[PDB]
């Protein structure tokens, strides 16, 4: 029984970062030889595990989180980082053990005139904890006058829209990010290499 990485890499659609999708991988054998995206990753870095050893290491669970941010934000998908994506959208713990993978998807997530389906949280009352998801839509109160659900002066809707035109600078182009987590928590191993 094979690990379903193909639906993580070859997925037609990707979640927005505030609503980041998590796939759970268990009870399979992992074929790590496949050249996903013709191995055309702008970022490829693990923390804790060695990619060299993964073919003969076993795990209890592999969690696969995926989303879309812009190019100069990928720097934040790493342990101990701060910024809008790390504070308000997707936070990695300082003790992260797993891989961050990212590629430029300007060819997919950019429209003439702009793709506006991808969102990110611009305001939040406090920073996210590691692996927290926040799908709230409450008007954010940026002043002293309370906001009773009305957008306006000092009253902001917390999600904003990435505007992905194919002519943007590369730092403003859409990137697909996959974040693999390798867990080994006092339980039987279900995910191994061949």
């Amino acid at each position, epitope marked *: 029984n094979l690990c379903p990485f193909g639906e993580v890499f070859n997925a037609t659609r990707f979640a927005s970062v505030y609503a980041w999708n998590r796939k759970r991988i268990s009870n399979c054998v992992a074929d*790590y030889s496949v*050249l*996903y995206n*013709s191995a055309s*990753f702008s970022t490829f870095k693990c923390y804790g595990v*060695s*990619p*060299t050893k993964l073919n003969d290491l076993c795990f209890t669970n592999v969690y696969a989180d995926s989303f879309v941010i812009r190019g100069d934000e990928v720097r934040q998908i790493a342990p101990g980082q701060t910024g809008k994506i790390a504070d308000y959208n997707y936070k990695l713990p300082d003790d992260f053990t797993g891989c961050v993978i990212a590629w430029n998807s300007n060819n997919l997530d950019s429209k003439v005139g702009g793709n506006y389906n991808y969102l990110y949280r611009l305001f939040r009352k406090s920073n996210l904890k590691p692996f927290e998801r926040d799908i709230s839509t409450e008007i954010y109160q940026a002043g002293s006058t309370p906001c009773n659900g009305v957008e306006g002066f000092n009253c902001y809707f917390p999600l904003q829209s990435y505007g992905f035109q194919p002519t943007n600078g590369v730092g403003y182009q859409p990137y697909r990010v996959v974040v693999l987590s390798f867990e080994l928590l006092h339980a039987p191993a279900t995910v191994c290499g061949p």
Partner: antibody
Amino acid sequence: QVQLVEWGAGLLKPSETLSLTCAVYGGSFSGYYWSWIRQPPGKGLEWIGLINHSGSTNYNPSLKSRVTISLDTSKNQFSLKLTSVTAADTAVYYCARGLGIFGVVTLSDVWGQGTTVTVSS
Amino acid sequence: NFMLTQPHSVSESPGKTVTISCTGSSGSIASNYVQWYQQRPGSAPTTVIYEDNQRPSGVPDRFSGSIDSSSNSASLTISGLRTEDEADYYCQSYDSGIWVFGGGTKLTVLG
């Protein structure tokens, strides 16, 4: 102990085709990526491309138009084809075994000893 | 389009320590792993460091690698310099899945 050798050609005239074979002794091509790397005399290293057990390839864009890497699980060999050869293709040509994930080779552990290829008229 | 540039040559007396820097340009070096090769003349390259700082089995612990993100640099450090250490050293990373090598640095153990 696993070991590689590459061989073939050597004296080429411009426009000809470079063909090299690499034989693997002491292992198989499973769970390893197989690259060709070249080094012009006195210059640095340049990665040509790789191939995995399934036969998928990923090539260096500097050569992609003219390069082919092919596998032969039956004879335990893999090969290089470099067409439309020029003098800038004179180098020492290595085959090397790699380790990694998803096409990213994070450790190249064993190399062959290398064959030289001279392109002159 | 990511460039890895290394010094042309570095030298040091035996038993001392040397380091070989490898600076990235047009991108961030921390986004991919750096590998370091040693090439003794007339032989194929062998790896001494991989994944920024890991040593393959059989490589002395006096080879060590490091990343300095403040300057977009990796560095190969060899301590207790022996003459067997004389060689060209190549750092190697990636630009979107394609291997990128450095210029090479020729290490001379002053004899």
